[PDB]
Amino acid sequence: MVRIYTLTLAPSLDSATITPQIDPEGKLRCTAPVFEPGGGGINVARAIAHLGGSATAIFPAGGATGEHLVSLLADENVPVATVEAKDWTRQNLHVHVEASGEQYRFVMPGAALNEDEFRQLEEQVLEIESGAILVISGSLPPGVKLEKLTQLISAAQKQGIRCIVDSSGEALSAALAIGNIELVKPNQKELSALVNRELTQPDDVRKAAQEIVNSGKAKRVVVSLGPQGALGVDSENCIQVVPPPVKSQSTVGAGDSMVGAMTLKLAENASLEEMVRFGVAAGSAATLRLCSHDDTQKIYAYLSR
Amino acid sequence: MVRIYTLTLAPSLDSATITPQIDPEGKLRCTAPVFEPGGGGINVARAIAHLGGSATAIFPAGGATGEHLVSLLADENVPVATVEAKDWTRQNLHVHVEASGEQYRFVMPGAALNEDEFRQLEEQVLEIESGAILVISGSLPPGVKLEKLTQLISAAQKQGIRCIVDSSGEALSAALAIGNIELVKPNQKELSALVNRELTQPDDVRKAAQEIVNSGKAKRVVVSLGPQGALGVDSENCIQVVPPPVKSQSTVGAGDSMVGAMTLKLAENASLEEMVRFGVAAGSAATLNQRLCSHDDTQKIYAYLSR
Amino acid sequence: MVRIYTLTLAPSLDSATITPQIDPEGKLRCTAPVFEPGGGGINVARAIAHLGGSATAIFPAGGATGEHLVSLLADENVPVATVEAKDWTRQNLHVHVEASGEQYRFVMPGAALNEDEFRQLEEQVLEIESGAILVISGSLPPGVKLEKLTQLISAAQKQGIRCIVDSSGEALSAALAIGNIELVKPNQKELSALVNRELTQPDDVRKAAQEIVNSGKAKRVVVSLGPQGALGVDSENCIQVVPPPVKSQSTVGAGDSMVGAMTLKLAENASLEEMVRFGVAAGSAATLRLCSHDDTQKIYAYLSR
Amino acid sequence: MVRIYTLTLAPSLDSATITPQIDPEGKLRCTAPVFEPGGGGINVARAIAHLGGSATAIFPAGGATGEHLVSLLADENVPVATVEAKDWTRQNLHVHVEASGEQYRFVMPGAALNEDEFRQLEEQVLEIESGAILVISGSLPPGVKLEKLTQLISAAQKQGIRCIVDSSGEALSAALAIGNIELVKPNQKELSALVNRELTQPDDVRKAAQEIVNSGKAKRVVVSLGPQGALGVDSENCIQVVPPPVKSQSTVGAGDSMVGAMTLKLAENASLEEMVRFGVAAGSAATLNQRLCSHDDTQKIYAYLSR
Numbered sequence A, C: 001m002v003r004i005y006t007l008t009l010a011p012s013l014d015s016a017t018i019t020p021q022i023d024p025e026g027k028l029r030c031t032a033p034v035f036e037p038g039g040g041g042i043n044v045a046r047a048i049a050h051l052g053g054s055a056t057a058i059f060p061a062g063g064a065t066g067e068h069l070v071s072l073l074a075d076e077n078v079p080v081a082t083v084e085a086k087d088w089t090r091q092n093l094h095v096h097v098e099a100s101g102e103q104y105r106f107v108m109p110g111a112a113l114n115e116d117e118f119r120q121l122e123e124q125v126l127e128i129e130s131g132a133i134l135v136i137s138g139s140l141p142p143g144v145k146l147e148k149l150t151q152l153i154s155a156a157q158k159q160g161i162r163c164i165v166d167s168s169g170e171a172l173s174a175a176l177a178i179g180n181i182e183l184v185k186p187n188q189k190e191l192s193a194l195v196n197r198e199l200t201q202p203d204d205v206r207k208a209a210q211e212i213v214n215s216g217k218a219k220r221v222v223v224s225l226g227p228q229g230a231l232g233v234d235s236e237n238c239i240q241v242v243p244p245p246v247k248s249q250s251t252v253g254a255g256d257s258m259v260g261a262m263t264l265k266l267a268e269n270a271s272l273e274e275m276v277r278f279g280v281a282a283g284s285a286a287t288l289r290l291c292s293h294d295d296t297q298k299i300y301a302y303l304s305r
Numbered sequence B, D: 001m002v003r004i005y006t007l008t009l010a011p012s013l014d015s016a017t018i019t020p021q022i023d024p025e026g027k028l029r030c031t032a033p034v035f036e037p038g039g040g041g042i043n044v045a046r047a048i049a050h051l052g053g054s055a056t057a058i059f060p061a062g063g064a065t066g067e068h069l070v071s072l073l074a075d076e077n078v079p080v081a082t083v084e085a086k087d088w089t090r091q092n093l094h095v096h097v098e099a100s101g102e103q104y105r106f107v108m109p110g111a112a113l114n115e116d117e118f119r120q121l122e123e124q125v126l127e128i129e130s131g132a133i134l135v136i137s138g139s140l141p142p143g144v145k146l147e148k149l150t151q152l153i154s155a156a157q158k159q160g161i162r163c164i165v166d167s168s169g170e171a172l173s174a175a176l177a178i179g180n181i182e183l184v185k186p187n188q189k190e191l192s193a194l195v196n197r198e199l200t201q202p203d204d205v206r207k208a209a210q211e212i213v214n215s216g217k218a219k220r221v222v223v224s225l226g227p228q229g230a231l232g233v234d235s236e237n238c239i240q241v242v243p244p245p246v247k248s249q250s251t252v253g254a255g256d257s258m259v260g261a262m263t264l265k266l267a268e269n270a271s272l273e274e275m276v277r278f279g280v281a282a283g284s285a286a287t288l289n290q291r292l293c294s295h296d297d298t299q300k301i302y303a304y305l306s307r
């Protein structure tokens, strides 16, 4: 198996707090927050650790929040490589409401990155050995032009770095601009936005995914379909894998868990079918903070029936 | 093709209205109601009509609301057979909230049936010829014992009427009490209650469905799974059908549409696979717009599922 | 004291039901409804009965719902005079949500009235003896043109019937069109709509109310101000009465209770001050289905300190 | 006019953001935060500035967030006196929901203060000269004993600093423990808890307020009543002031504005009536827009109340 790294341009120190009620106008008294590592590539790395593998998380860190984010990851035994940033690591807020048992997630943009920090992030990435896998996951923070994302991925690819991309909107297009991307995991929304047309017909998602493979923009496209699972596309195969008929308790961390699972499968040179199954297994395991090894194992064995 | 009848012991004259915002305390000013046919078996009969089929809807009807329910179905070319009830046909409320674009459905019990009005309904049911299909769908209204429902199904079965059941709670249990139902469509919640245990493992739903078949309660169990489609089970077969990757705009009224589709397939003696696929096609067709499934959407999805 | 009658052009059989949760999309299973008399003039009459007086409620009734509405009022010992209508008496739905303890009120328009029923309603009103008081309260149902409301009030007034009006929007203007109205109780919204300008300045409400008295459109204008009470205006006096600093548990039935109280005071030829105080007392008592005699008494004694 | 100082043991760097809709489960995408000064005594000092007065805000500040809180107040010409804390200044979240136009405020505890950082804050407080006014407003942060707050008020009083208190829970009780507070502004909830009983009768709030005065805990009790205005109580007087019949757009941050107004009146030795009227004027001025009271709106309302 090859080495795995992730990149999170917009990391977060996520604070989880509780309040009895949610209602407008008044003050909602919240408990003192419990902190946790936030960000796409970061969660992908944590999911990989849950699933037994190892992934180095690359990201910018600033202020005492950044230091706290780095310290959480140390406690969870996830390797990191950071560049210090001027703007302090931002905080997303997850609020649990007692009276309903429900969660609310307020996701702000990440901290800003100036030209210089991005170049430091690029230097760190180009340190990755050839053949190794890099998962670029999450949104694009303020201060980064889309052309700079494209240049990073080209640069990485020019020296044998295998690139996996999970992102949104123009950031996704910027990633696929150069092409030869190893793996992309848009959900439905991200797919419709990337292709710029509504996906209203039964075969629309498949045709759109197949187009991306055929145009060479990506070697593999896995479209995640929430409860319906995921549809995966090669130059060779096309496959849909549906999760077990089991009730979902939350949505949090499904995408990143799936991406981590599929990354571990890609690194192991598994078949397209193995990869999507393991991805759906981990994605759905997370819906039962992320995916556990035993839950993923159970679901993967069932799909592998 | 055999004849198809549906039974709705608790029909409804539902009102669809629009209000700008939803919030407690204040008066929520609602637009003039737009009336629509309500009830399980009624909507199964409406879906069958849309799918180019035909089914006679048997239901009680009382008062000006009863008359408007009947007249609504007349305008839809849905054949009916009604019994006049003393208590007025009830009205559930469907509220569209402009601000969020959301819909709320407030579902109240059906009007009461006295024992005479029930007797007339069973009499209409027992006029159905042997070999024809009867779909019993929806909740049980006040004034009817559970035993009355079981006795009705036993009597109909005794004269060769093939029964399809869609219900919940204690009513679903009692429909399955004497067994030999042709087809039941529980969702995940209804299957769990029916079998009286948690379905949390990957293979539980399938096993729960098979258990109902092996016990003789039903020849066919199709567990509907919302966006995950459906898991259909036979004495010989088991198939899951997943709908196409198209997002849904609503959930009303997907269960009834599916049941309408599968009843039609049953009337055609189609294989289990075709029944379930056509079920998912119609159900998912109904989710495509915020009343039921249409012929063309269903055909489109079914052809995709059959490819 | 003179005799009191009310008129409700848009009556309602209100059904109150309970559900554990309120949420979009799914089916909200509601208990079998508990029915209660709905409509402005109807509630005004019930409030008058609670406060010891007697008021005859005039309204159209149709279908089994109308019959049920009539039967509820019989049980509460409120006199009625009905005309039978073709369109069945409509049902507004009040939903109590267990998980929050909150109420939601869905108010549809009343049943339609054709030309003929309205004339029957007019005939019933013109049967009222001269000098007696008629409270016209509530919204205008489908099938009634605003000119017909105006004609009814003129007709009533032409033969000594004392008219009190509580309504909304154009219906309110239609009422004041003829002028010499005994008493109007707009709230803030209704006042701003009646006068057609935003009431943004401190003295705006008073000036607007005073204008109506001075123009002769109404002998008395009481603007209700929710928790701030009510501001009442004569040709002579101008007075604001504020409720006791007591927490409010619900809003339901505040306006109608206030109007009933003030009607009883008007019938007793009380001063403007007595009238508004008793109105605020009953209005606020209701916020603690309507106003109780003891609660109103308590608050009225406090205001009368 | 004497000098005015405020104390905020739990200041905040609050972020105001906008999201289209609010609902559980999904990610609620929020716009880039817009930062604003948070904290009781800070906002009292900001309101005083708006009202054309001057007050020095004493508070702890840590990290880049602390620096931005300080810089925000600099841009507002609010004099400050800060103590550097180790733990970073916290951030509450204010969320504007476009769909409904509503605002949600998620209010978390202030950053911790160690005993040394508290010592420095008291040292800054005790540099205030006799006869000057100190407003202690807001919650108590972690790491501070209730006794530390009481000792601070006793020490300040001992050297002639006139103290105004706005707080809640156990902190408010302890501020009133040694008595002789110049002015406390509880709302209805805070008054009820403070006196530890239900205020349900018409005359209860007034009696509760008078009880606090007669006990010596405070010379002036002004109970704020939301839209009903305020009930101010003295050893000699009692006055309720109701705001004008103008609807409010927000409730943020009406309490602090009122306190700022009344502090200014106290510094002018105005009668109780003028203090309360000016209090309601500023408080209600702040409710006129969705940050605090403005000079012109306050003047307008006060002139109306004084007519």
Ligand SMILES: Nc1ncnc2c1ncn2[C@@H]1O[C@H](COP(=O)(O)OP(=O)(O)OP(=O)(O)O)[C@@H](O)[C@H]1O
Pocket (backbone or CB within 6 Å): A186, A187, A224, A225, A226, A227, A228, A229, A230, A243, A246, A247, A248, A251, A252, A253, A254, A255, A256, A258, A279, A280, A281, A282, A283, A284, A285, A287
């Ligand atoms: N409601 C659900 N029930 C069962 N499995 C689910 C459910 N939602 C997501 N999953 C599993 O997680 C995988 C990824 O989730 P999803 O399709 O929603 O991608 P995503 O939207 O990018 O996730 P995220 O919103 O966290 O970034 C799915 O393929 C599926 O296997």
Ligand SMILES: Nc1ncnc2c1ncn2[C@@H]1O[C@H](COP(=O)(O)OP(=O)(O)OP(=O)(O)O)[C@@H](O)[C@H]1O
Pocket (backbone or CB within 6 Å): B186, B187, B224, B225, B226, B227, B228, B229, B230, B243, B246, B247, B248, B251, B252, B253, B254, B255, B256, B258, B279, B280, B281, B282, B283, B284, B287
């Ligand atoms: N969110 C969805 N996305 C795609 N298809 C759906 C969705 N929800 C329902 N369907 C289709 O409709 C069929 C029946 O719906 P469902 O599984 O929710 O049964 P149900 O709960 O009895 O419906 P109902 O609440 O109307 O009685 C499903 O099998 C599926 O084919």
Ligand SMILES: Nc1ncnc2c1ncn2[C@@H]1O[C@H](COP(=O)(O)OP(=O)(O)OP(=O)(O)O)[C@@H](O)[C@H]1O
Pocket (backbone or CB within 6 Å): C186, C187, C224, C225, C226, C227, C228, C229, C230, C243, C246, C247, C248, C251, C252, C253, C254, C255, C256, C258, C279, C280, C281, C282, C283, C284, C285, C287
């Ligand atoms: N929140 C409250 N707290 C104390 N008293 C209240 C409150 N709301 C209403 N009242 C009392 O009830 C009286 C009438 O209520 P209001 O001003 O809201 O008129 P309204 O809006 O026409 O009532 P409704 O919405 O029921 O038709 C007020 O003058 C006041 O005395």
Ligand SMILES: Nc1ncnc2c1ncn2[C@@H]1O[C@H](COP(=O)(O)OP(=O)(O)OP(=O)(O)O)[C@@H](O)[C@H]1O
Pocket (backbone or CB within 6 Å): D186, D187, D224, D225, D226, D227, D228, D229, D230, D243, D246, D247, D248, D251, D252, D253, D254, D255, D256, D258, D279, D280, D281, D282, D283, D284, D287
């Ligand atoms: N809804 C309103 N309408 C008119 N004026 C208001 C309203 N709410 C508050 N005010 C004004 O602001 C003053 C203080 O507000 P309030 O009574 O709610 O105290 P508070 O609860 O401590 O405020 P805060 O929650 O900001 O600490 C009130 O006395 C009143 O003058």
Ligand SMILES: [Mg+2]
Pocket (backbone or CB within 6 Å): D187, D251
């Ligand atoms: Mg408040």
Ligand SMILES: [Mg+2]
Pocket (backbone or CB within 6 Å): A187, A226
């Ligand atoms: Mg999603």
Ligand SMILES: [Mg+2]
Pocket (backbone or CB within 6 Å): A166, A255, A256
């Ligand atoms: Mg994702």
Ligand SMILES: [Mg+2]
Pocket (backbone or CB within 6 Å): B166, B167, B185, B187, B255, B256
């Ligand atoms: Mg169903």
Ligand SMILES: [Mg+2]
Pocket (backbone or CB within 6 Å): B187, B251
């Ligand atoms: Mg359902």
Ligand SMILES: [Mg+2]
Pocket (backbone or CB within 6 Å): C187, C226
């Ligand atoms: Mg109102």
Ligand SMILES: [Mg+2]
Pocket (backbone or CB within 6 Å): C166, C255, C256
């Ligand atoms: Mg009213």
Ligand SMILES: [Mg+2]
Pocket (backbone or CB within 6 Å): D166, D167, D185, D187, D255, D256
């Ligand atoms: Mg306060």
